[model samples]
Target chain A: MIFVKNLASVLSQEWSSTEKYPGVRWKFLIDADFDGSSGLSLGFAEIAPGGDLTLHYHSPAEIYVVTNGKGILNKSGKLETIKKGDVVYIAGNAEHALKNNGKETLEFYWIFPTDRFSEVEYFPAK
Target chain B: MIFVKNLASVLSQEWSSTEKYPGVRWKFLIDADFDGSSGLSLGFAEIAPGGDLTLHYHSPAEIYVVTNGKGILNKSGKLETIKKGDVVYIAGNAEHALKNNGKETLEFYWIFPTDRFSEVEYFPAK
Candidate 1:
């Protein structure tokens, strides 16, 4: 099923959750909306300049392929700068957070291996 | 496990399968090498100009993100030109093939929602 005609259509259905995660917006390319039969979910995420994701970990490992701008990824207390083409792997249950360290907006292609996006548990890091 | 130090390292260990799929080379970025974890595998694939992937389908769906170059994707006899930033979603068991229609090498990031890469059954279309 070609649920999304193109990337633009996926972005058009904006699901911005700035209240839950300030300055962050998520657009699912492969999710319930598109029949995630692959047992995985894919999407694009953007973090505005000076924005950051809350410290959290997941039941399933997550991957992020930086598509634009620059950011800082904190994985288990180890900080690493990330840019375009950089692949970031956050092992399952490993605490992690991301921040837009550059002046421009940070965007990335993110994937989680799960049939449904809601199946992933984002365990908040206390 | 950090089996791959970075993208460069992943690119260093090559697995070119021209015999299986003419002019197709696969380099696993996340496979059994590091971990077939997250219940999915990730990798980069390239098809030289004039080359193409054999018409095949899998039990589990697959997704490809064009990272560079241009190509033509044939989905169930429907032909579509693809280029950088193009996202392709191949439904499970849907026959498809890809050809490098451009002069340069066509590269893309591919993902399959499976614990191991071998688990994917590439049933060739006659």
Candidate 2:
């Protein structure tokens, strides 16, 4: 069991990551404190306007809870516009990614299954 | 992406489940508004005092964010007491179950991945 504070704590933890691109900063909650053999993980992600993520997909699947801003999620050639409070799910092999189209940073929580063998695969956006 | 209201909506939706026990009730959020081929599902579950869940585990792993009550999570012969605010992870193949040891109802959100090939296996308490 993991006790995580707020979004700030998720972003500030040692497991978090902050990667900068051309015009946006990528702050991420890579992992929450989890017990081994437990089957889940929780993380948060923030992508600034004009910023995008490497095209990636995971084996077990992922859930995105958009907390703020707006963005477009591209999956298997279909694009979905999402705003605050939108919950998006990405199945394995869908080849998905998020682009911040709004003026503000796009913030969302990335929830995933914990099986270590479940790998995340990256692909080029079509 | 799906827009779901609060915890109640997740429990009241058509996809929810309400199963009764000998002296307790089991209200569960079986599914939330979700898009097909998506990789996630969110549900809330309430187990009254003395209530219990079938000894089960899922193939994709699951996350439990306890919102209320107290209970014991049995995993691999280990017993852990969980209270409000404790987040637990149940990985696949672990054979786990929850028992409401407290006087109040134990409520928690069961978050799981959306892959179809993944399955939850049930096992007897050790």
Best by lDDT: 1
Q: For residues B1-126, write the lDDT of model 2, one tens digit per residue.
A: 222234444444443333523233433332333324445566556787888775655456666666678888876557778877455666556667778988988876667664432244434444
Provide the lDDT at A96 for model 2.
Answer: 73
Model 2, A13-90: lDDT tens per residue?
443343523444433332433324445566556787888875665465666666679888776567778877456666
Model 2 RMSD, rounded to 1 decimal:
6.2
Give the poorly placed runs of model 1, Cα more than 4 Å off.
A2-5, A35-38, B1-6
Residue A124 lDDT, candidate 1, scale 0-100: 77
Q: DockQ: which candidate is best?
A: 1
Residue B16 CA displacement from its true place in model 2, Å: 2.5
Q: What is the C-alpha lDDT profile of model 1 across B1-126, one tens digit per residue?
A: 222224676655757575868888887777654564556577788899888897888888777877789888887887888887776777778888899978999988777776567777678896
lDDT of 1 at A72: 81
lDDT of 1 at A60: 80
